[PDB]
Amino acid sequence: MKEFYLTVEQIGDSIFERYIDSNGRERTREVEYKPSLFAHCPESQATKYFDIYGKPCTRKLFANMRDASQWIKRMEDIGLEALGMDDFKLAYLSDTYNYEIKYDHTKIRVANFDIEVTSPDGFPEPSQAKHPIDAITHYDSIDDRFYVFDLLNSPYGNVEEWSIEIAAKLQEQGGDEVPSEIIDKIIYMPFDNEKELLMEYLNFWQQKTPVILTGWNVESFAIPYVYNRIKNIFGESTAKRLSPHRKTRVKVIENMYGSREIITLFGISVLDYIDLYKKFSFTNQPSYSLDYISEFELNVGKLKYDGPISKLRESNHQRYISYNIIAVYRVLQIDAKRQFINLSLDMGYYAKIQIQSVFSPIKTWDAIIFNSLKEQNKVIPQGRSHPVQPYPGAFVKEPIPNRYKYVMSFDLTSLYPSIIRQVNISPETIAGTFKVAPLHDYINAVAERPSDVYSCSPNGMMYYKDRDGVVPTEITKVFNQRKEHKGYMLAAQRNGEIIKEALHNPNLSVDEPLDVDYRFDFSDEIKEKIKKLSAKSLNEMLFRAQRTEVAGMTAQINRKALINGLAGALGNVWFRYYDLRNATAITTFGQMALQWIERKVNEYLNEVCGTEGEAFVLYGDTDSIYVSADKIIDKVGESKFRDTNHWVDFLDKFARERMEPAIDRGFREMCEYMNNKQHLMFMDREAIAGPPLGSKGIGGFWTGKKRYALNVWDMEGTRYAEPKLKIMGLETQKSSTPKAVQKALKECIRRMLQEGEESLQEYFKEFEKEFRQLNYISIASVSSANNIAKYDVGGFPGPKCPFHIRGILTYNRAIKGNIDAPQVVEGEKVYVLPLREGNPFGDKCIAWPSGTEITDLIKDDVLHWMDYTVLLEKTFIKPLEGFTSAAKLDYEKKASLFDMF
DNA sequence: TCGGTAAGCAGTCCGCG
DNA sequence: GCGGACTGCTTAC
Ligand SMILES: Nc1ccn([C@H]2C[C@H](O)[C@@H](COP(=O)(O)OP(=O)(O)OP(=O)(O)O)O2)c(=O)n1
Ligand SMILES: [Ca+2]
Ligand SMILES: [Ca+2]
Ligand SMILES: [Ca+2]
Ligand SMILES: [Ca+2]
């Protein structure tokens, strides 16, 4: 097989590399890598190396990496550019793996671990590590085994061995319900003392050294705790055995309001799953506890135990250990679904970076562009310092707040990357500038044509047309990968709908789910077999189709995020290719494109309808337009349609056969106007929305920019078994909105769009009547909580204290002196409830850590004093009033003359 | 929360005769 | 009470 790296590090003048050799074996080597950098040289001097602007360079080969770094410093002292890859390990990888990396995940040791630490005096601080580590569960992907290290004797209690037999039993038999599929994969090791546990753990680590190390909060808790605990018991040299090169560094992670420490383990790639999830999931969750995320992702119940976690080991060591094992498995289950590790490996190896660098789009693109340029013996520029400067972004149309009955949306494919490719925007393709007119003048095609030679953006920039820039070349590659995965995602989505349809008529039989590839549209034969399947088999197929769709979503959305990240990196001062001329060339072209096509779409539809000056485009945001289709439907007449699916088909055909060609003609003209390199503005129909045929539903409404709701029948070619609400921006979509209130507001919206005003009024009256019975957690608001200290003046709110921070201060006073009470963690999320006048907490609200029950010490009092009236007004009535006033509807029945009978 | 801009709403403070 | 200046937070792209 072709070799591939696992990890790479620079330690002084050596590169330390772990890799898989040509026989599939893991190896380690230390290489005295001699880096090269570059200086500009005279034109009359033969070289094969040129900078990106075509200026010749001489290569400087250094005796060692320290010499190279010192040279960079002296070049700064002199005032001359030091060119080339200054991150020497990326240069090493580029020299050592000068081909597209083919990696084999089965050879990569991926470790998932979790530790338990009993602590009587609150949260066990990793930098102190003053409490024994009393359990470690460490799953190894190569062995496919859960290694359980269990401390039986501690100063906080002596316990009996954990029983795998009890662990396997149902909770109803007094068991822990450790899933049967992992029972035979557990290797259980009890220890008489913590010193022996840790020594054995280190020997095990040495034998089975993680390449990728993950788990939940491992980077912020488990790793620093284990490192510091071993350091405290045994000394530094022993703790450094967690690094295969025996090198570690305390790394200070700074943010706006403070800092924290992590431990860098040289020769390991730490991908904390909480951070993978935050980056790649595209969710914003009210809590990031593993129990909360597990329930969200997997629909598994919370891990149930009695009493505080600080007393769990002593009271129920059996459950304590079982829950540590289950916690490790939950992360593997989330990964089996989401496939974030797979994604990270794919992107890291593609870019030729340390796998952990996938967190940095700047590092990722720097490496991609570097490797690309190096292929042509081109030399990258030195990074420079720049002041942070604001720059303009997208255009968003102000909508007229209203109901909108029939709506068709259109959207540009991968807009910013398409602009980069169309215009040819790159550091080395800048050709010059032209005299800019107001943007309105380009939108309306009255400005002078910018150039007859170069490709232009309405910000004034011109670009070469003779050859593709490196940024367009490399962005196109990732764009093409993204397109492939999005195809698989949409097919799985369409396949899911076929199964949902068939589930209306399940057959009474015993059978099996069909063996199919859900990434490809089902054939006629498959469709025929599906129509004969039982509900059991159909539901199993639906689950599998949906898992396929999720895997496709992960692969496609994050490749989209990467290419959009390159457009944004051009506006980040730390990017080697930072240039506000290029960043603004993209965003300004985007503003023009949207408003240009708004004009063209209005012109086309006014022509087909035989009107002038009427506004068909009701809204647009960045790259999408929303078109009122009422007049199109009305030209046919609602009476002429058999059912909802009939007018949806008609609009689908109208959009594909009439509107899309008009839109294409409009953009081809714009391409010629800007003299662009290649026409790539591809705007396709996105959604078809409207009320069910014959109903009183309103179809859709807008309240303002980035705030609307539509009843969608077809989305990007997926014809839904049942209409789907597309709600953007409204409170139903906000993590700050209470869970039960999101649900209620969504149903109000469903009723508005699908059934009408009377149905909405019926539901509102019931909710208002019953909501006080809702569980307190389900009606609590949620907020991130920053700067608790800033607003804390003797335990009371300082000037301008935010509402949620006020709540935290109330909580802090209520739990004062109690060492065991859960503390609110700066920067994390809290639940917030309003409190009625004259409550014993002395303030108008209280807040406590999100994802948790409020402590038993004050729970009773919180429940008794919760202000349900304020809660309802603020989270439910106020947003609903906004929806209904926009839609010109009443949520309560107005008096009429009939009341007189 | 270590890792592009536009723009919405909640809440504080305080004016507005 | 409602709006502007401002902070804080959270979305849509
Ligand atoms: N984090 C983000 C999200 C979006 N955008 C910009 C660039 C996108 O091209 C544009 C429109 O975003 P969309 O969500 O409509 O997605 P794209 O058009 O990029 O992709 P798709 O092909 O899915 O429509 O907004 C951005 O700069 N950064
Ligand atoms: Ca735990
Ligand atoms: Ca788009
Ligand atoms: Ca059937
Ligand atoms: Ca869009």
The Å distance, CA of A800 to C1' of C5, is 13
* Domain CATH code at residue A671: 3.90.1600.10
Grouping H, G, I as helix, E, B as strand and the rest as coil, residue A493 is helix
Q: Are A507 and A585 part of one and the same domain?
A: no
Contact present, A309 and A134 (Cβ < 8 Å) = no
Which of A701, A729, A757 is the C-terminal boundary of a domain? A729
How far apart are alpha carbons A273 and A278 in whole angstroms? 8
Which of A556, A572, A588 is the C-terminal boundary of a domain? A572
Q: Return phi, psi of residue A250, to 5°.
A: -75, 125
In DSSP terms, A462 is beta-bridged to A432, A456
A 721-740 residues, CB < 7 A, strand B? 729
CA of A297 to the centre of ligand 1 (A): 25
Q: For helices A470-502 and A535-569, what crossing angle results, to 10°? A: 160
Query: Which residues have a Cβ under 8 Å from the Cβ of A254 and sit 6 or more positions away?
Result: none
User: Is residue A301 domain-resident?
Assistant: yes
Q: Are A115 and A259 part of one and the same domain?
A: yes
Among all ligands shown, which has an atom nearest to the Cα of A564?
1
Q: Is the dihedral of CA A262, A268, A269, A270 positive or negative?
A: negative
Strand C at less than 7 A from CB of A411: no
Query: Which residues have a Cβ under 8 Å from the Cβ of A41 and sit 6 or more positions away?
Result: A47, A56, A57, A58
Grouping H, G, I as helix, E, B as strand and the rest as coil, residue A780 is coil
The Å distance, CA of A797 to C1' of B13, is 14
What does the block give as tokens for A113? 């671990």
How far apart are alpha carbons A154 and A141 in whole angstroms? 30
**CB hemisphere CA count around A450 (13 angstroms):** 31
Strand B at less than 7 A from CB of A801: yes
How far apart are alpha carbons A622 and A414 in whole angstroms? 11
Contact present, A849 and A777 (Cβ < 8 Å) = no
Burial profile A41-76: b = 16 or more Cβ within 10 angstroms, e = fewer: eeeeeeeebbbbeeebbbbbebebbeebbebeeebe
DSSP states of A616-627 as a string? -EEEEETTEEEE
CA distance readout (Å), A82 to A94, A372, A766:
19, 19, 71
* Domain CATH code at residue A787: 3.40.1820.10
Contact present, A213 and A268 (Cβ < 8 Å) = yes
Q: How many residues are listed for chain A in this entry?
A: 901
Q: Is A799 exposed, middle or buried (0-12, 13-18, 19+ CB in 10 A)?
A: exposed
Contact present, A200 and A189 (Cβ < 8 Å) = yes
Q: In the block, which residue shows the tokens 């510091």?
A: A228
Q: Which residue from A889, A666, A852 is spatially nearest to A777, judged by alpha carbons?
A: A852
Compute how many other C-beta atoms are within 10 angstroms of the C-beta atom of residue A142.
Answer: 14
How far apart are alpha carbons A883 and A861 in whole angstroms? 35
CA distance readout (Å), A793 to A74, A281, A810, A828, A844:
50, 38, 12, 21, 17
Q: Where are the beta strands (DSSP E) in A208-310?
A: 212-214, 248-254, 259-265, 269-270
Q: Are A130 and A147 part of one and the same domain?
A: yes
Q: Which residue from A344, A345, A331, A366 is spatially nearest to A471, judged by alpha carbons?
A: A366
* Chain B nucleotides reached by a protein CB under 7 Å: 1-13
* A97 torsion bin: left (phi>0), alpha (psi -120 to 50), beta (else): beta
The minimum-distance atom of ligand 1 relative to the CA of A413 is 22
Contact present, A291 and A851 (Cβ < 8 Å) = yes
User: Is residue A895 domain-resident?
Assistant: no
For ligand 1, is residue A569 a contact (CB within 6 Å)? no
User: Is residue A901 domain-resident?
Assistant: no
Tell me which DSSP letter residue A776 carries.
G
Contact present, A727 and A749 (Cβ < 8 Å) = yes
Q: Which residue from A617, A758, A638 is spatially nearest to A693, judged by alpha carbons?
A: A638
Q: Are A699 and A785 part of one and the same domain?
A: no
CA of A742 to the centre of ligand 4 (A): 35
Grouping H, G, I as helix, E, B as strand and the rest as coil, residue A832 is strand
Q: Which residue from A619, A643, A637, A625 is spatially nearest to A719, judged by alpha carbons?
A: A643
CA of A688 to the centre of ligand 5 (A): 15
Q: Where are the beta strands (DSSP E) in A690-800?
A: 700-704, 707-715, 718-728, 781-784, 792-793, 796-797
* Three-class SS of A637-693: CHHHCCCHHHHHHHHHHHHHHHHHHHHHHHHHHHHHHCCCCCCCCCEEEEEEECCCC
Q: Is A701 exposed, middle or buried (0-12, 13-18, 19+ CB in 10 A)?
A: buried
Grouping H, G, I as helix, E, B as strand and the rest as coil, residue A499 is helix
Report the run of H or E that residue A502 belongs to, with start and end: helix A470-502
Contact present, A583 and A605 (Cβ < 8 Å) = no
CA distance readout (Å), A839 to A9, A349, A844, A845:
59, 59, 8, 10
Q: Which of A284, A391, A414, A681 to mutate to test the pocket of ligand 1 (most atoms within 8 A of CB)?
A: A414
What does the block give as tokens for A434? 């032209």
Q: In the block, which residue shows the tokens 């046919």?
A: A636
Among all ligands shown, which has an atom nearest to the Cα of A320?
2
The Å distance, CA of A883 to C1' of C1, is 21
Q: Are A20 and A119 part of one and the same domain?
A: no
Grouping H, G, I as helix, E, B as strand and the rest as coil, residue A366 is helix
Which domain, by its residues, includes A883? 730-774+867-889
Contact present, A141 and A110 (Cβ < 8 Å) = yes
Task: State how far Cα A757 lies from the chain centre.
Answer: 37
* Three-class SS of A547-562: HHHHHHHHHHHHHHHH
DSSP states of A865-896 as a string? HB-HHHHHIIIIIHHHHHHHHHHT--SSPPP-
How far apart are alpha carbons A821 and A843 in whole angstroms? 20
Strand C at less than 7 A from CB of A564: no
For ligand 1, is residue A623 a contact (CB within 6 Å)? yes
User: Is residue A835 domain-resident?
Assistant: yes
Q: Is the dihedral of CA A224, A225, A231, A234 positive or negative?
A: negative
Q: Is A226 exposed, middle or buried (0-12, 13-18, 19+ CB in 10 A)?
A: buried
Grouping H, G, I as helix, E, B as strand and the rest as coil, residue A362 is helix
Q: Kindly give the pairing relationship between strand A269-270 and strand A212-214.
A: parallel
Q: Are A121 and A103 part of one and the same domain?
A: no
Q: Which residue from A176, A149, A110 is spatially nearest to A326, judged by alpha carbons?
A: A176
How far apart are alpha carbons A404 and A401 in whole angstroms? 9
Q: For helices A415-423 and A470-502, what crossing angle results, to 10°? A: 150
AA letter at A426: S
CA of A622 to the centre of ligand 5 (A): 7
Q: In the block, which residue shows the tokens 């088909």?
A: A649
How far apart are alpha carbons A250 and A84 in whole angstroms? 29
In DSSP terms, A715 is beta-bridged to A687, A718
How far apart are alpha carbons A360 and A362 in whole angstroms? 5
In DSSP terms, A254 is beta-bridged to A259
The minimum-distance atom of ligand 1 relative to the CA of A623 is 11
User: Is residue A896 domain-resident?
Assistant: no
Query: Which residues have a Cβ under 8 Å from the Cβ of A877 and sit 6 or more positions away?
Result: none
Contact present, A325 and A148 (Cβ < 8 Å) = yes
Q: Is A431 exposed, middle or buried (0-12, 13-18, 19+ CB in 10 A)?
A: middle
Number of domains in chain A: 6
How far apart are alpha carbons A530 and A204 in whole angstroms? 49
Query: Roughly how many angstroms between the first and final C-alpha of chain A, as a whole number?
Result: 88
For ligand 1, is residue A415 a contact (CB within 6 Å)? yes
Q: Which residue from A481, A215, A470, A214 is spatially nearest to A347, judged by alpha carbons?
A: A481
How far apart are alpha carbons A863 and A780 in whole angstroms? 11
Which of A695, A729, A763 is the C-terminal boundary of a domain? A729
Strand C at less than 7 A from CB of A787: yes
Q: Are A215 and A284 part of one and the same domain?
A: yes
* Domain CATH code at residue A520: 1.10.287.690
How far apart are alpha carbons A152 and A197 in whole angstroms? 10
Compute how many other C-beta atoms are within 10 angstroms of the C-beta atom of residue A24.
Answer: 11
How far apart are alpha carbons A376 and A788 in whole angstroms? 54
How far apart are alpha carbons A817 and A821 in whole angstroms? 9
A 378-437 residues, CB < 7 A, strand B? 390-396, 398
Tell me which DSSP letter residue A219 carries.
I
How far apart are alpha carbons A156 and A117 in whole angstroms? 10
For ligand 1, is residue A502 a contact (CB within 6 Å)? no
In DSSP terms, A16 is beta-bridged to A9, A30
Rg (CA), chain A: 31
Q: Are A244 and A168 part of one and the same domain?
A: yes
User: Is residue A899 domain-resident?
Assistant: no
Compute how many other C-beta atoms are within 10 angstroms of the C-beta atom of residue A685.
Answer: 22
**CB hemisphere CA count around A202 (13 angstroms):** 20
Q: Are A195 and A290 part of one and the same domain?
A: yes
Q: Measured CA to C1', what is the nucleotide nearest A575? A: B4
Report the run of H or E that residue A190 belongs to, with start and end: strand A186-191
What does the block give as tokens for A752? 């508005």
AA letter at A198: L
Contact present, A340 and A555 (Cβ < 8 Å) = no
How far apart are alpha carbons A558 and A895 in whole angstroms? 53
User: Is residue A449 domain-resident?
Assistant: yes
Q: Are A117 and A180 part of one and the same domain?
A: yes
Report the run of H or E that residue A490 belongs to, with start and end: helix A470-502
* Domain CATH code at residue A751: 1.20.1280.300
The Å distance, CA of A894 to C1' of B17, is 37
Q: Are A200 and A99 part of one and the same domain?
A: no
For ligand 1, is residue A9 a contact (CB within 6 Å)? no
Which long-range contacts does A891-895 make (Cβ < 8 Å, 24+ apart)? A891/A748, A891/A760, A891/A761, A891/A764, A892/A761, A892/A764, A892/A765, A893/A761
For ligand 1, is residue A567 a contact (CB within 6 Å)? yes
* Domain CATH code at residue A240: 3.30.420.10
Q: In the block, which residue shows the tokens 């129909």?
A: A685
Among all ligands shown, which has an atom nearest to the Cα of A321?
2
For ligand 1, is residue A414 a contact (CB within 6 Å)? yes
Contact present, A698 and A889 (Cβ < 8 Å) = yes
How far apart are alpha carbons A842 and A92 in whole angstroms? 63
Q: Where are the beta strands (DSSP E) in A307-420?
A: 378-379, 402-403, 407-412
Dihedral in degrees, nearest 10, Cα atoms A90, A95, A98, A100:
-20
Q: Are A189 and A316 part of one and the same domain?
A: yes
Contact present, A420 and A474 (Cβ < 8 Å) = no
The Å distance, CA of A418 to C1' of C12, is 20
User: Is residue A294 domain-resident?
Assistant: yes
Q: Which residue from A707, A709, A664 is spatially nearest to A685, judged by alpha carbons?
A: A664
Q: Is A687 exposed, middle or buried (0-12, 13-18, 19+ CB in 10 A)?
A: buried
How far apart are alpha carbons A798 and A791 in whole angstroms? 5
How far apart are alpha carbons A84 and A408 in whole angstroms? 50
Helices (H), A264-308: 273-280, 290-298
